[PDB]
Symmetry: T
Subunit: 144 residues, 12 copies
């Protein structure tokens, strides 16, 4: 069983700026944590990070029927992309939306999510542990 | 070690009653049991309170200041309306996880705003009652001065 | 057969200020009128007035399955309380919303009603006779 | 004693035709009959007019000034759009009850505003055609200088 | 002689009895008489129409194209609501003066917008029925220059 | 088989102002084009143009069950009339909304259409050819 | 003997030069001349002020309280922006006619709102400088009643 | 002697420990003591109630009708949200002074609206707990004139 | 004579896959075939491109400037969001017909705004894939300096 | 020795005459008198200015920088409209108490917003002229700490 | 010979003192000096005015009509509020470059709107006092063409 | 020498032919040449990239972190729409000058908002391609002080 792990724009920079101020956790840390949780359920993870909205949409489309679900952190595309929302819908994958930080503690333009309209679940502000909980949700939906 | 304050707001006592094949079969008892079981995995306890009275939830937040490690709250309809409850979360100084069973963003526009999200360390929506399990996990693992 | 008659905040003050300016009708008048109409249909009325939103919600919850319907004048909670709307829904009682005055002739913040989203019927500006008409609606829905 | 002006606006002539098991089987004839029967209980008469033409309803309001005791109106879609109809209600000086068969607040956002509600003594929504019966009862019992 | 189209929209037939504290006690007959007297000073005539029917005002505008020097219009409630009536004023090509008896910008917020003001050469509000007299003056003097 | 062709306020003035600036096409041109397209499908056209909203509503009501569909250019009523929207719904006719010009290139108050909420299809800015395409849509829906 | 306060707000001194396709070829001198001549037909006088300084218009309104029969005002850009000027019109207790040379409701959205229209007995827009003549007519005939 | 109703809404019991950088270190006891001392200067008494329950504040207002010279209220969060509490202030007929410790108009936009300000005779914000002292002064002097 | 640029935006490749009895059975291949067939009736050709990448559609618009007679575009979700795509339509100077298969006005409020409608000569919504056929007809018949 | 800058903005000179049912029968002289007498109880002086000219209030704020302990201001209609005046209060670095005689949040919606409240340490509304006395009390006791 | 009108609106006289973390440590004297020196490199002169009085800026715009090659303006808080000043820029017919020391679109929402940007040929924000140098460069080179 | 990243977003490759009445007749080559000449005056180089692809601009920003003294960006349409691009400017830690050829605040209301202005040190609009010259000047002089 395979989960699609998608990380959107800027997520490649996790842990790359001064980590004492901007965080020590890296994208590799995110993938490893999601992968280890998936392994507890006999599942695998296909991970992709891209600063290109089209590469995420292509990935969602290509995973239709082949994956049990999608964990997505869309980054700034959260607030802006109808096309990304329509790609989650077209994929027909049960999708969990993850934010490492709590967008509602940030600027008001970050409060709105298009993805939240189609996501089965939304996890914000749990740090990279949101990706662990997202894998648990998809593992357990699939079992039901 | 320590105690988590579990707060369920108005209407949460009625979980599982209306059209369960559409809205869910899980009950408030199931919620408290699931959170209490996850807390035990971390050597923690849960003090659960459900109320239809905003002031009862505010009283509980105030009384838990300095004696509890954190709060898991599902404010129900107060989520969208109560400044006083947000100020009670801040006054408690409890690190707070906001939980919704359903995804409010899939519902009416008035349900898309949360006062509690402004102060919550984390917000979990649409994971069913599993949201409460992940909330207990977050509070168990939070360290002083994180983020 | 029993109808739940709920009166929200401030309704206890009906008829208590100078009645020539603020009205002669009292809460007792409201309960008696609803009760007499209910009696015409072989029905009874359980009446509660509270300045506490929680006492109304508790009442709605406790009347689930035991009452044929709810007549509610929510007072200022009309415009503000999502929790009260969700309590009407959770009660599963057919609910008639009553306003003694016409809110639409008052300040604009009184124009919006959360209760109107779940109420079967809304009666405004008929004075205390709105409670009579509300009982008639519930008596006749029950008969069908 | 006296005559009530019963006004039904655009589309009310088509009551009972579209998906009646969902929207209703009652007809305009049923509405006029029900209001006329309630009026008779109070020694009153009804003059009923339905029109798809705003100006016909305005003409009728003007012509009823001083000769009728009040107006029961269901403006249909004009409810949300017509300042001229509101001004015609005011010009008629008829105490006016606004009636909707369905509850407009359960429908699209544009149906939540009513110009007529600003001038109406009473507004009844969602009582089916029984709304017209209660409206006649209100006008029968209204006293000069009430509220 | 040249002719001015005087159009009064819904409810203006009720002038005199209609909310006098707002509209005064002057009647539609008084409005037409004053406009007619002012036009005569300029050697002009007035063709007056009041209707409660938006389509009658539109028909009148179309039918006045090319035979009238201009239009004086009080659209009443239709002021705030009718795109169709604005489009009829434009299609008539009549220089159009918009008149209101009350001052709508001192009244409810729903009266603050005017479709007709987008096409009117001039707008007069709150001058009781004298607005119609000034409107005729505007049109007589526009025609003299053009 | 009959199509109801409705033209709303001001459409009678098509081609009547200086045509080099305001257009040469006339209402007669619109009716002839729709009629000729309908004839290609063995269908007829009943055409009505009115500056009166009530005459359009009456027409829609009277065509219930007797016509295969309605082509409507509502003119300025597009943006304003809930009553006209409710008349399209009450008619139960499959309805195509036509604009000769593109309203979205005009003032912002012309961007909103009530009719678009009930119309099966919306054609804007194709000139009078939008009426031809509207007839094609209704001919082909009827065949299915 | 009866006196009308004629106030013109910012930029009105530039009439005849300022954006002629919007405001026309008439001058502030033409405006004052027309208002003055109309007032004389009613046996009234005109005290005219134009200023680019809001405070000078407000002082003029206060100073005319109880001594003048009314005010004709074209506030210019202050029409859309100044609560202080609205409050000065109300403090003056002068019946006030608001005049605009241009039709503001045919221009940018920010010109659609007028604080002065909340207190004005009458508003005239788009009649060129003739709006000032009609405004004197209004004030002359309100006083006469 | 005359009596002033001092009402503090939700969270004000936590004054002292609650967000001191915003609310200061003065306690509810300090608030009640200062109001009580000021009232005594005017030969008046204070009946103080704090509650986290909107209905207890409403009950208190109803029950103070006709036995209190006025009300000093800090509604806390309910300021921005409660029509019911405004309606209770109105029904009490108590001359009402609205007090805020912080300046809400310098804070989040959701704190910029006040239902209570629609019925309050006066509103004092941002004067720490001294707002309650000035509020008592307002009510003592209103009563002296009326 | 000449070539029409047919652009289909994000997700249009997935046409016909999700709940086809509800959303439709027609495919992107059907769209290209229908537009290509109508173009042939007018002695015209079609260059079709579908992409999930906004920049690919912008590149295509730029590369078609002066070499194509017009553009038929269904921007998909970019309709509501992309200023850059509107500016690419303007930079191409291609007369452009905007096509939607479904009627966006019957859907969520955010789908009611189109940047492309501001520059498009025509907008067709809700004619199914027949919209693309009418779009090709419009471009075939457009004359220089019309309207 | 300590000096308080007392500023009154447009129309305040008309107190006692201007819309008495809203503003009452007290005068600007009563306001300055009350503020002056309260300041004296704290051993402070008052420098009072009223102007219908925004620029005169802004100059006064700049000129009081570093020499005064605080500002009491009633901006009048400028309360709702002037970013320049807010920026003048911030440039002054004076602790500022905003005073309104009327309760603006009980009046027209356009009076609900105050640029000055963004910088003011305190806002008093609806206490008649007594708000100016409480404002001096605030400034006296902030300085004392 | 060619003359540039340099206008600074309210509070700009307080540069170097006013909220240094937002506006920096440069003075109005530094601003005028930099603009003057840049204009000289193009053989142009600068006529500089700063005022806390909107009416003084409007008078300056009118008085520079036809005699000056362009205007560099920092309107201060009036940027967001004054239709009268926008209309004065249009009446002047001067090519106008709008300058802000701070980046207003990085500050409070009420600073996001500029009436002046509707008429300005160019807008420079956040370049400190160097924006005034670039503004002279723009005006010098528009005139040269 | 130090290097400045010059980024041009969608449609700017079409400068010269694109709506000249709005953007002028200067080409992207001219933009790059002018920025390059100005940088040389300060002993600096320019690395220029134009793309119609938001992700290529983001990749460029990430890849320029720590090797460039600053960024000059004209985001084109993405200005008003892209949170992702703002977040990339922030993550790059490059002092960033935002440049527009046209004055967007004199144009459609949808052009009035800029995400990039929230992180840019400076914003220059409406100076034709000279905005890029001033932008280089800003970055050369910021670097000299820091």
């Amino acid at each position: 069983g395979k989960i699609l792990l998608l990380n959107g724009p800027n997520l490649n920079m996790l842990g790359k700026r001064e980590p004492d101020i901007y965080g020590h956790d890296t994208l590799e840390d995110v993938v490893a944590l999601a992968t280890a949780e998936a392994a507890k359920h006999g599942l695998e993870v296909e991970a992709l990070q891209s600063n290109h909205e089209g590469e995420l949409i292509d990935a969602l489309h290509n995973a239709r029927g082949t994956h049990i679900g999608c964990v997505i952190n869309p980054g700034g595309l959260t607030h802006t992309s109808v096309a990304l929302l329509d790609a989650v819908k077209a994929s027909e994958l049960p999708t969990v939306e993850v934010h490492i930080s709590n967008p509602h503690a940030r600027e008001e333009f970050r409060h709105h999510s298009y993805i939240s309209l189609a996501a089965v679940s939304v996890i914000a502000g749990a740090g990279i542990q949101g990706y662990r909980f997202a894998v648990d949700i998809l593992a357990n939906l699939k079992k039901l």
